[PDB]
Design a protein around this ligand. Structure first.
Ligand SMILES: COc1cc2nc(NC(=O)c3csc(COc4ccc(F)cc4)n3)sc2cc1OC
Ligand SMILES: Nc1ncnc2c1c(I)cn2[C@@H]1O[C@H](CO)[C@@H](O)[C@H]1O
Length: 351
């Protein structure tokens, strides 16, 4: 029904009231509201994607995945409010639990103790273990996608770029997909356009760990070649065999033309960090995806030994499946599927 706030309209309510602007997401404003059903404050994502096909893909993907996932380190969807008629629907409001902050903003104001870092990492990898067990790739793990309520309450969010894992799905379309925010993008994405393996999420987590240890991003490239420059500057010039799985024969070039850099020792870059953290970091930031540590091995690393508990780390009941590949569907078809997926939150949804 009613409502406004900062000039924009928020067709939330009567249920949701006492609004209060929060900030900006992708294609939408984001306030907090009071849920008059649940008698607590919640976050409401106002999304306007239907203009561009790509924005509708991401919006669709996030709904399908979050509605199927259930895990305490992964944000849920509590309520989806949209218009009654498909033609009259031009906004979508996604209602989710209200979180105090996210890792990105927290790292702007605080240096994290080893302890706190340790249990943040544990909660990231516990959530990641459920995601990968569902055969799903997040593909955009980074601090602003880690929502935080306390040192003991971390939730992964924003599954807009997620995919079902397809260790074979190749396409080598370097301009055809947006895979990971640049600073957190694994080398095999940039060198082989190989963005459908679980290794890419582990890389990102490694970038997030490095960032927790120093309050700055470890690889802040301006563009993708500068990104590779920052990686080789700490990892050192690659081997022949790491240069073996560089499928793009032209991608070779800017690397071969490089001045042999030495591997910077982790403890030199992070003199104050726990050596156990620095050893796990080493396993996560391996250039070659095939030697990089997997999520269950990361959880079992000695650095997480205080918390690792396979009996309290849920996995998915069944692999997740996109019943249709929506890579190339017109944005009017996607808007249809969105209208459908959000049907369960409308009066009279049968079945
Ligand atoms: C979310 O708000 C809070 C923030 C917060 N930050 C804290 N940091 C320290 O106490 C603290 C004590 S030694 C230290 C330095 O660590 C390292 C480790 C490795 C490295 F390579 C560089 C540095 N850091 S404790 C804390 C509690 C908060 O809420 C209860
Ligand atoms: N559930 C939530 N609780 C708090 N903040 C959230 C969310 C969601 I989902 C997204 N955001 C966005 O991330 C930032 C939080 O610091 C904010 O800028 C906001 O854009």
């Amino acid at each position: 029904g009613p409502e406004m706030v900062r000039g924009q309209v928020f067709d939330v309510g009567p249920r949701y009231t006492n609004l209060s602007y929060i900030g900006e997401g992708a294609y939408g404003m984001v306030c907090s509201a009071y849920d008059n059903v649940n008698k607590v404050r919640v976050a409401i994502k106002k999304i306007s994607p239907f203009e561009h096909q790509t924005y509708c893909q991401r919006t669709l993907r996030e709904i399908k995945i979050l509605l199927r996932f259930r895990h305490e380190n992964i944000i849920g969807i509590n309520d989806i409010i949209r218009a009654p008629t498909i033609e009259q629907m031009k906004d979508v409001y996604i209602v989710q639990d209200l979180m105090e902050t996210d890792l990105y903003k927290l790292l702007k104001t605080q240096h994290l103790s080893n302890d706190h870092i340790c249990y943040f990492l544990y909660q990231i990898l516990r959530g990641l273990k459920y995601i990968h067990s569902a055969n799903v790739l997040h593909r955009d793990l980074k601090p602003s996608n880690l929502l935080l309520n306390t040192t003991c309450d971390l939730k992964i969010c924003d599954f807009g770029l997620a995919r079902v894992a397809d260790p074979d799905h190749d396409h080598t379309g370097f301009l055809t997909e947006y895979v990971a925010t640049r600073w957190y993008r694994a080398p095999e994405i940039m060198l082989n356009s190989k963005g459908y393996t679980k290794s890419i999420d582990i890389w990102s987590v490694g970038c997030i760990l490095a960032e927790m240890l120093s309050n700055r991003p470890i690889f802040p490239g301006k563009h993708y070649l500068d990104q590779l420059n920052h990686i080789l500057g700490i990892l050192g010039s690659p081997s022949q065999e790491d240069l073996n799985c560089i499928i793009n024969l032209k991608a070779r070039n800017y690397l071969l033309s490089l001045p042999h850099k030495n591997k910077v020792p982790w403890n030199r870059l992070f003199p104050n960090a726990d050596s156990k953290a620095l050893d796990l970091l080493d396993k996560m930031l391996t250039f070659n995806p095939h030697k990089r540590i997997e999520v269950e091995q990361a959880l079992a690393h000695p650095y997480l030994e205080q918390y690792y508990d396979p009996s309290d780390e849920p996995i998915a009941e069944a692999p997740f499946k996109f019943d249709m590949e929506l890579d190339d569907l017109p944005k009017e078809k996607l808007k249809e599927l969105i209208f459908e997926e959000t049907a369960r939150f409308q009066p009279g949804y049968r079945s």
